Design a protein around this ligand. Structure first.
Ligand SMILES: [Ca+2]
Length: 970
């Protein structure tokens, strides 16, 4: 083909192979220049499926499951391949048109891998292919001699014919030779308005290559013709022969014997005698008889097709029949029996849609039965069948019976291809599991309740489905690293129990949606997304094009750095992991309960894999590399619960939504979008590392450390959102331990916090923020909300945070030992000392801003708790409550400094409480003096308690309701 040098070559390559943006059904594909300018759009119909075209050189196109279409001057080729190339179909009659440069070759077998294309509804009608209303667009592809043309018509040859495929658009076509031939100036490769978005001209070797058109009357793509010639290299135009409808009609029809009808009236069965050496046979239901022809010597063309019909036919074979290229077609249900061990072979069987054929006739060693049509073939022979099976459409039920030696075998191998068919196993004796392979676009193997063991999964791609569709659960035991491209579906468990000390990864870039459990023991498991397969060339062709300044040419189907990946989704009841390394890479979603024992689990693992043979068939070449999702759309997702036990490690680097139940393990979070639900950690550190951002959205209980280094942990609510559906939660750690300047511990309203808080560096701890409870609260939700005593936040622990900024609103802080803070902000918060009396407790801060807040210090008349402020104290309307732990007497005196602050601080920033805490029934009296470089508030007397209609005094500071505290301040 010849293309213009303005568009990137890879477009034409990908277009021809239905890859990348050119997958079948892709719509509105926009096309751009090398200089990035818009040239046009593929918007007249969805991208067509080119898979009826032969995959290696595109000189022939399947127009019937048994006939290709090409030009007769293509006299050499003797076979073609479809899809991924892993097949071979041989010509048995070139079927040349005698006046037209055109042929319609009959093949040896029925093709299973692909559907044939539809052909023009019109055929050789003069002028038809100029009506843009009916046919808006024409596409072609071929592998002729490949050039690029510049502006000034100069030609550079990139390769010979039959090296690779190129495809593109073609302009509307005029007819000549009475409508038998059509043509267009397709060589005008820079004229987009005339020739479409990707103009291409056919060259030597593009002979026979197809032309397709979108037919808006039928709303579908249609093969119109096949390419015959052009005006030489870089020439002005091409000619095509229009598919000749009367001719291909004659070619099909002449292969059919007269149509065989069963009537029950004529009696017993149709008896099928076949004389080997003449290659002839008959089908006799006692009186009536039916001609049948088969193979003759090495001549497969001597066979003719049979078409069987009539209600509930029945046919018995007396002789082994060798049908050659004759095929069978069942338009009605039939059963085909044999007591002689008569075999049958031929081109294939077609079972019409809604038809079932019980087939009890074995094959023959080294042959392959081909099955197609959308109906069902029930295979019920007796004994070992040594034949093979290639299925391509509808259903095949394997129900082979045992012989008198008890041996059974439906087939020696089974190949499932095209995406249309299903193979059903009645039991586990029909086939050796390792001999089942899935070709181009796959199909389903339905294990139908039987549990099985596979040492391999020979699967070309994502259309390969292993499944179980009945409610008798079944297990698939695997036992080969290893790559599976396919899908696992339905009522299954899957066991991947490796023997000890192995380090081979089982890799899945396909998908899974199963109702049971997936078990890995030892090794690696990697579930991941799958980069889009693209066309590629050799390194020499990519260099030649780089030489000419086009860098678009690829040298492998998939790579680690490409932007286009397919999303994959994995769903199991349970993912059980023992002694494994488990990874969920980019472009994958996992929905499971993970049950891990001595395993690592990396959610958002950057180690992922490509298959160097991806798209070339069932052979694969794994390579491991690095690919990190940077865009939310490509990021792994995990939903569910992670149970960790016995030295397990969980690394959260992806979009995570789950509860954690952990014992004797570790969790490390570096993801900036993790949401932890209800969690319990026992001997399990929880590390949030740099850049991480996590929400504990429900209760969180650990007996251990929660380490926040330059990360952000929010409990109950985030500090960039106000919620009106909060529930009261627990939040317990052995310790909350921040480090680094950027660390943040945000504790939302209705969190009951417990555990010491330790801050290294200038991190920030914030207790309280906006948010309202849900109107709908369980009883436990009510019983817990009650324990808050009118406060939004309760914390019990001690604060070691000398350079930190700490902030508390509407909080009740029970401080259990000496505490330090760099910068403290209190707003309507009550702080109660609750360390020793052995010596009392100190709170030391550098800077305290305090507003409508209170401190409750305890005394024994000799000593007390103490607030120390070193550098600045600001705010207003704070109260010192004194819990006199001994009833003071006026025959005895008081001199205890309770708050000390810079000398310049206002006097009334602190005032004595108006109310009592404790048993003493007295209020404090507080005097200001300056002393050893700081203003002091001194407990130097007491006062008989005023009864201000509040009821009894709070017994300790824990009994100071918020309403008590707040109305005292006011
Ligand atoms: Ca013929």
């Amino acid at each position: 083909g010849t293309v213009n040098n303005e568009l990137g070559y890879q477009l034409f390559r990908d277009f021809a192979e239905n890859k990348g943006m050119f997958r079948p059904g892709a719509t509105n594909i926009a096309i751009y220049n090398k200089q990035g300018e818009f040239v046009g759009t593929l918007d007249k119909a969805a991208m067509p499926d080119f898979s009826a075209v032969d995959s290696e050189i595109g000189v022939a196109t399947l127009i019937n499951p048994q006939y290709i279409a090409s030009v007769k001057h293509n006299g050499g080729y003797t076979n073609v391949s479809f899809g991924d190339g892993e097949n071979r179909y041989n010509i048995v009659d070139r079927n040349n048109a005698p006046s037209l440069d055109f042929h319609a070759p009959r093949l040896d077998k029925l093709v299973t891998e692909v559907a044939p294309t539809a052909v023009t509804a019109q055929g050789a009608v003069a002028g038809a292919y100029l009506d843009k209303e009916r046919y808006p667009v024409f596409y072609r592809l071929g592998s002729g001699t490949q050039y690029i043309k510049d502006s000034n018509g100069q030609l550079t040859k990139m390769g010979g014919a039959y090296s690779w495929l190129t495809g593109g658009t073609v302009g509307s076509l005029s007819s000549y030779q009475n409508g038998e031939m059509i043509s267009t100036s397709s060589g005008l490769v820079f004229d987009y308005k005339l020739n479409g978005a990707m103009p291409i001209y056919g060259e030597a070797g593009d002979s026979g290559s197809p032309l397709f058109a979108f037919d808006t009357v039928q709303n579908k793509w249609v093969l119109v013709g096949v390419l015959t010639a052009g005006n030489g290299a870089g020439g002005r135009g091409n000619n095509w022969a229009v598919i000749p409808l009367d001719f291909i009609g004659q070619k099909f029809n002449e292969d059919n014997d007269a149509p065989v009808t069963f009537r029950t009236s004529e009696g017993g069965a149709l008896e099928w005698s076949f004389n080997s050496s003449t290659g002839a046979g008959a089908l006799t239901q006692g009186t009536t008889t039916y001609a049948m022809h088969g193979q003759q010597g090495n001549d497969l063309n001597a066979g003719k097709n049979l078409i069987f019909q009539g209600q509930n036919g029945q046919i018995n074979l007396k002789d082994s029949v060798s049908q050659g290229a004759g095929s069978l077609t069942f338009r009605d249900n039939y059963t085909v029996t044999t007591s002689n061990g008569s075999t049958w072979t031929g081109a294939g069987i077609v079972v019409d849609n809604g038809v079932s054929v019980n087939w009890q006739v074995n094959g023959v060693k080294g042959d392959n039965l081909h099955k197609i049509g959308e109906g069902t073939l029930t295979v019920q022979g007796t004994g070992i069948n040594e034949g093979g099976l290639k299925v391509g459409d509808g259903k095949v039920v394997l129900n082979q019976q045992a012989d008198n030696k008890g041996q059974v075998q439906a087939f020696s191998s089974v190949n499932i291809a095209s995406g249309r068919p299903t193979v059903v196993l009645t039991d586990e004796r029909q086939v050796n599991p390792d001999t089942v392979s899935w070709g181009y676009r796959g199909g389903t193997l339905d294990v139908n309740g039987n549990s099985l063991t596979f040492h391999q999964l020979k699967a070309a791609d994502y259309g390969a489905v292993l499944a179980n569709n009945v409610d008798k659960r079944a297990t698939i035991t695997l036992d080969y690293g290893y790559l599976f491209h396919g899908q696992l579906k339905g009522n299954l468990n899957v066991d991947n129990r490796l023997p000890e000390g192995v380090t081979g990864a089982l890799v899945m870039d396909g998908a899974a949606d199963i109702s049971g459990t997936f078990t890995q023991e030892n090794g690696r498991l990697t579930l991941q997304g799958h980069p889009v397969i693209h066309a590629y060339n050799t390194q020499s062709v990519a260099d030649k094009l780089a030489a000419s300044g086009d860098h678009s040419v690829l040298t492998q189907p998939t790579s680690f750095s490409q932007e286009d990946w397919e999303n994959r989704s994995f769903t199991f009841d349970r993912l059980s992991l023992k002694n494994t390394d488990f990874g969920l890479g980019r472009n994958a979603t996992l929905n499971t309960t993970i049950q891990a024992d001595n395993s690592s689990v990396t959610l958002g693992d950057s180690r992922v894999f490509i298959d160097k043979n991806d798209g070339q068939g069932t052979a694969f070449t794994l390579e491991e590399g690095t690919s990190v999702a940077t865009k939310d759309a490509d990021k792994s997702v995990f939903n569910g619960t992670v149970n960790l036990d016995n030295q397990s490690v969980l690394n959260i680097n992806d979009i995570f939504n789950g509860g954690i139940q952990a014992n004797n393990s570790t969790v490390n979070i570096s993801s900036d979008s993790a949401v932890l639900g209800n969690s319990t950690l026992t001997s399990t550190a929880l590390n949030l590392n740099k850049g991480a951002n996590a929400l504990a959205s429900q209760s969180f209980v650990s007996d251990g450390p929660v380490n926040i280094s330059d990360a952000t942990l929010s409990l109950n609510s985030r500090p960039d959102e106000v919620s009106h559906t909060l529930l009261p939660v627990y939040d317990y750690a052995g310790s909350w331990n921040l480090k680094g300047d950027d660390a943040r511990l945000n504790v939302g309203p209705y969190s009951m916090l417990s555990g010491n808080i330790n801050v290294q560096d200038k991190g920030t701890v914030t207790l309280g923020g906006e948010g309202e409870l849900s109107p709908d609260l369980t009883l436990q939700n009510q019983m817990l909300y009650s324990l808050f005593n009118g406060y939004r936040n309760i914390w019990s622990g001690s604060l070691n945070a000398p350079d930190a900024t700490v902030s508390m609103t509407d909080t009740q802080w029970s401080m259990n030992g000496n505490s330090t803070a760099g910068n403290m902000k209190l707003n309507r918060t009550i702080v109660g000392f609750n360390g020793g009396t052995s010596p009392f407790t100190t709170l030391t801060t550098d800077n305290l801003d305090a507003v409508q807040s209170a401190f409750v210090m305890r005394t024994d008349l000799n000593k007390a708790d103490k607030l120390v402020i070193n550098k600045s104290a600001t705010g207003h309307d704070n109260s010192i409550w004194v819990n006199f732990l001994k009833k003071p007497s006026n025959k005895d005196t008081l001199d205890i400094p309770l708050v000390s602050a810079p000398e310049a601080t206002a006097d009334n920033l602190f005032r004595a409480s108006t109310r009592v805490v404790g048993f003493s029934d007295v209020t404090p009296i507080l005097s200001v003096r300056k002393e050893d470089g700081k203003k002091e508030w001194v407990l130097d007397g007491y006062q008989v308690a005023r009864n201000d209609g509040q009821g009894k005094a709070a017994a300790t500071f824990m009994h100071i309701s918020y309403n008590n505290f707040i109305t005292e301040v006011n």
